[PDB]
Amino acid sequence: TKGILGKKVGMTQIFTESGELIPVTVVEATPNVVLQVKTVETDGYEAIQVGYQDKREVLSNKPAKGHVAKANTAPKRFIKEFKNVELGEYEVGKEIKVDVFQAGDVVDVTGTTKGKGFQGAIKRHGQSRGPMSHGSRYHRRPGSMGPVAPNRVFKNKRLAGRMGGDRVTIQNLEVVKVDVERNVILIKGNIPGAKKSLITIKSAVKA
Amino acid sequence: YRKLGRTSSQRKAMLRDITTDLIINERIVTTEARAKEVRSTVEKMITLGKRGDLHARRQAATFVRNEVASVREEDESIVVESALQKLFNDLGPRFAERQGGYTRILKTEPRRGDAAPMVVIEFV
Amino acid sequence: NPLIQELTQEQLRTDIPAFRPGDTVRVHAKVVEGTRERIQLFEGVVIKRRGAGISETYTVRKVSNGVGVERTFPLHTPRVAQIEVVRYGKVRRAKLYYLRALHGKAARIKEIRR
Amino acid sequence: AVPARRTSKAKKAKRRTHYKLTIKGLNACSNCGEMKKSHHVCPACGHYDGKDVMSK
Amino acid sequence: MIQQESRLRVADNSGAREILTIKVLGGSGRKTANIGDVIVATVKQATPGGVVKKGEVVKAVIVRTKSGARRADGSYIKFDENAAVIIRDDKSPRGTRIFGPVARELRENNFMKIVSLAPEVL
RNA sequence: GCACCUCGAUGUCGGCUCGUCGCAUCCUGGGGCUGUAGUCGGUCCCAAGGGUUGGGCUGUUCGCCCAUUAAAGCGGCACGCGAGCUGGGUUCAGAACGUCGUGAGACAGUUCGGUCCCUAUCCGUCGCGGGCGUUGGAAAUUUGAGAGGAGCUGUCCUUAGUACGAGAGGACCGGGAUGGACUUACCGCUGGUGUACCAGUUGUUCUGCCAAGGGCAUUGCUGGGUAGCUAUGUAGGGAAGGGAUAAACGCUGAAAGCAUCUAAGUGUGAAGCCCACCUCAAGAUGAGAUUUCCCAUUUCUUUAAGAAAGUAAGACCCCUGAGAGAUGAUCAGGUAGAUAGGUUGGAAGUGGAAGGCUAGUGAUAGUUGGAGCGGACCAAUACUAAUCGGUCGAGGACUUAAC
RNA sequence: CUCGUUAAGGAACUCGGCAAAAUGACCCCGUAACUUCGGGAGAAGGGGUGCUGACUUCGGUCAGCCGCAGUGAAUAGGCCC
Ligand SMILES: [Zn+2]
């Protein structure tokens, strides 16, 4: 249905009408452009291809310019597909701007979490330590690997490894304010990801 | 900002020495990590040498090494210049009208006993 | 930074008098007791101020009935109505955390004209 | 922990297939022709970027 | 935050001075208590004479903690002490006098007989 | 009970860390009977999705006690887990008590003390790359065969002091609010840290002296604190639904003129099952789909899916890096340039610089002046360094059919 | 592995406060039961400490000044039943 792509700027505060303080996250989204329309006769399902964030032109190649030429735009940096939206009602060239949402509008928000590197079982999985005194030599370790009988370790025995960097969505957040001349949405709470990272905002699945 | 294999006071000693060299010599051979950290420190000294006043002089004198000479000078005496005196009489007036960027690095070769990549860092 | 300051600019208060940690202050808070609106007053010494923007706060220390009380406020809430400077103090630092372990006469701050 | 069986010639050599050397970007000097590492000074003649550098 | 084996002063006229916390009623593994929360405790130090004698198991409500409370408008309050008031199983003080100042959260939790006798209500 | 197994070695119990499976079910869900008025209960049937607490005393399981909870289940896994921890206990050498023995000594009697080694080859488990394949060479967007996560539950308010009942007492079925434990992100707030940030102060030594500073003493010590990483901080979540079923309950109905849920026909029905929500996924050798980009030299073994050479679209080596990181990979850039350093303004932070002046016998104070300084943060600016270059990379098989 | 700091709580840890943290110098005041009359005893528990000037009988005392902190670093008993 409704849905837009933008970038993450940062967090701030705001007072409401009644005079309550509320933490917020600024998202900036210049106008998105519809590049392609997928149908059942051609593709086998129904969707919409959207682009965001204009790109300098030494940085693209000839196949990309050909794909962006039928829509009369500059080459884009981020291209996603938006599903479950009554097609009609849409055509290549159209611009989706932030006034698609209004204040209220419980929404879903997705991103890619920050990266953290190679991490141990205690930080990565919330596992608890061993004792720090009393003759102990077992501080920061992942536990026993299993029982003796099967002569092997089972799967989903959790260990150390690379942490972060996965996609995550958070459900049922509120739009606090929409500003049109600046292409800005204010969302109540915190979102996943670092600064300048891609963010997607859709109307909520659980309604 | 690059720990360089040293503790906190040995890093400071080593940088204070390598930037007082290159004030005295104007061209030096070193490894590649040290040269980057040093480009930063030396240009911070030159923009105090261009400021000129007493407060700037005493700010620099916390960082430039003291009992070192830099002499190509004799009218008729043994008249010594002090490597802080050179900073304030010679190198500041040289770069008067240039904005930042008073140095440059070139890459040469790995050292024989080490394979450490070496580098020349000079002024103009 | 400048995209955030622009959005939050139109919500900063302009009637805020100048004060430092060390000065004494009367805050004119607002309380809601059921449907009634009413105003309290909270008099004490400013001991903290940590800042930059709409996110600025300060805190005030008081001794009520033999127990010490601290109350932190944002600088720009509309739920305060008045900040009045009563005295000026002579102080040598920014965080007066050493006041929270003294009592009576040892916790005295000298005055100063400004 | 101790090796329970010796390793044969085929498995040793299959381990050792990612254990080689590389000789990366080598170009020809613009001033004197001979080969040299890119973004480095030319060791044969001391010229980098069309000028003389290891001289006074 | 107040947990098992924390010690509280008594802000009451009941004959108790110090109290040791035994449980943090409400839940099944809950850790900490706050301002307006009910507790089970031991009397550790009494006063010579008094309705309440030392060694007794009794209930009390927390006012006045060090790590204090937070209000909806963005403001905070903190005290220099931890204190409690011994309670009579339908929220009435077993004494007749509260000492010292009291947090305003005791209204929302409906200890209205206690908010009548406190000297100051912050 | 037996003595097949292991004596050129298969390390005991409780606790810790990490769990997994059965169901003879401890709670929560659905039911039939009651010596079921209501509120609570007894017992039997279906059900393994999730849940199942902190202390005191003992080396202790076991057990008793205290305070809570919806509840404080019972078993298997070498009575799970010592090349993962502990070594309190049992079972080495010392010493003592009761007791037995002429004695040396002895006791599932007791007491105080008492050495636990290992640099991971193979399979396995968690993460991360290179090679080739997917039948011209490439840049992007994707469907979903499969798979994994998640799955708990309390109190109040209303219906209503209504049904029920002499009274005491007190509902089903609905609607609304707010919690506990657990968990996914994040640094605006409250705090933690913050060894190239600011200030105060002791001893001694150096910059020739005074003033002003540097070195060392755990960062010498003490008071604050930016970015980054963080919880005890802040936001969210387990929402509502559909389908086929278990116990149970039918509707219509004969065999067997009646009766009967069943044989033919036809329904209802659970926290369970398949979807619904989140994440991974075409090496799914059954290797899928859509949009865009690029189009022919030389000798012949013989003309063949032939070899070799230069190229297109595109890619890489090499260099500046960080929102990324063990390395490699990923992402932002390479003068068609803000990629990193420097410079010029700013900010957080500290809290009033140096040099002079004025008032003091002095220690010091006031003033010039919210001063000076300022890692990582914010804008602008080609001043230095991303120079010059090289490498790889298509020419698209055959059969049948319809057009 | 060896070090430094930590909100709120403060032995809830474990066979056992193991290991850490806390006390620590000099001057002054004070100090129980018990006892072989020597002890117990540094019992316990409290106060002072920098810098300038004046007087200093002598040893110190008064007036003033500065900081969160004056044995401003390093070195040095935890105690009780
Ligand atoms: Zn050359």
- CA pair distance A24, D9, nearest whole angstrom: 64
Query: Length of chain D in residues, anyone?
Result: 56
Query: How many C-beta atoms surround the C-beta of residue B41 within 10 A?
Result: 14
Residue E63 phi, psi dihedral angles, 5° rounding: -110, 170
The domain total for chain C is: 1
* CA distances in angstroms from A49 to A33, A86, C11, listed in the order given: 8, 14, 39
Q: Which domain holds residue B63?
A: 1-124
How many residues are there in chain A?
Answer: 207
Q: What was the resolution (in A) of this experimentally determined structure?
A: 2.9
Domain containing C15 equals: 1-114
Nucleic acid strand F within 7 Å of A113 CB: yes
Q: How far apart are CA A10 and CA A23, in angstroms?
A: 11
Nearest nucleotide (C1') to alpha carbon of C91: F351
Contacts of D53 in chain B (CB under 8 A): 106, 120
Q: How many CA atoms lie within 13 A of A101 on its CB side?
A: 29
Packing angle between helix B8-20 and helix B32-49, nearest 10 degrees?
Answer: 70
Cβ contact A7:A193 at 8 Å: no
Q: Provide the residue count of chain C.
A: 114
In Å, the largest CA–CA distance within chain B is 48
A142: nearest Cα among A166, A124, A154, A163: A124
Q: Does the distance separating the beta carbons of C11 and A182 come in below 8 Å?
A: no
Experimental technique of record? cryo-EM
List Cα–Cα distances, C97 to C25, C45, C48, C62, in angstroms.
Answer: 17, 12, 8, 13
Cβ burial, residue A148 (10 Å; 0-12/13-18/19+) = exposed
For residue A4, the Cα-to-chain-centroid distance in whole angstroms is 11
Rounded to whole angstroms, how far apart are CA atoms C38 and C40?
7
Q: B108–D39: do the CB atoms touch at under 8 Å?
A: no
Tell me, yes or no, if E73 comes closer than 8 A to chain A by beta carbon.
yes
Task: Tally the domains of chain B.
Answer: 1
Find out whether B76 is annotated in a ligand binding site: no
Q: For residue A2, what are its two tokens?
A: 């409704």
Q: What is the DSSP letter of E102?
A: B
Judge contact between B41 and B19, C-beta under 8 A: yes
Calculate how close chain E gets to C57, using CA atoms only, in Å.
Answer: 9
Q: Side chain identity at A24, as an amino acid letter?
A: V
Query: What element of type H or E holds C15?
Result: none
**Residue E59 and residue E21: Cα distance in Å, rounded?**
9
Q: What is the dihedral of CA E16, E21, E26, E31, to 10 degrees?
A: 150
Exposure b/e, A120-136, CB count within 10 A at least 16 = b:
ebeebeeeeeeeeeeee
B114 marked as binding residue: no
Residue D34 CA, ligand 1 centroid: distance in Å: 6
| E72/A contact by beta carbon, under 8 A | yes
Contact between chain A and chain C (3 or more Cβ pairs less than 8 Å apart): yes
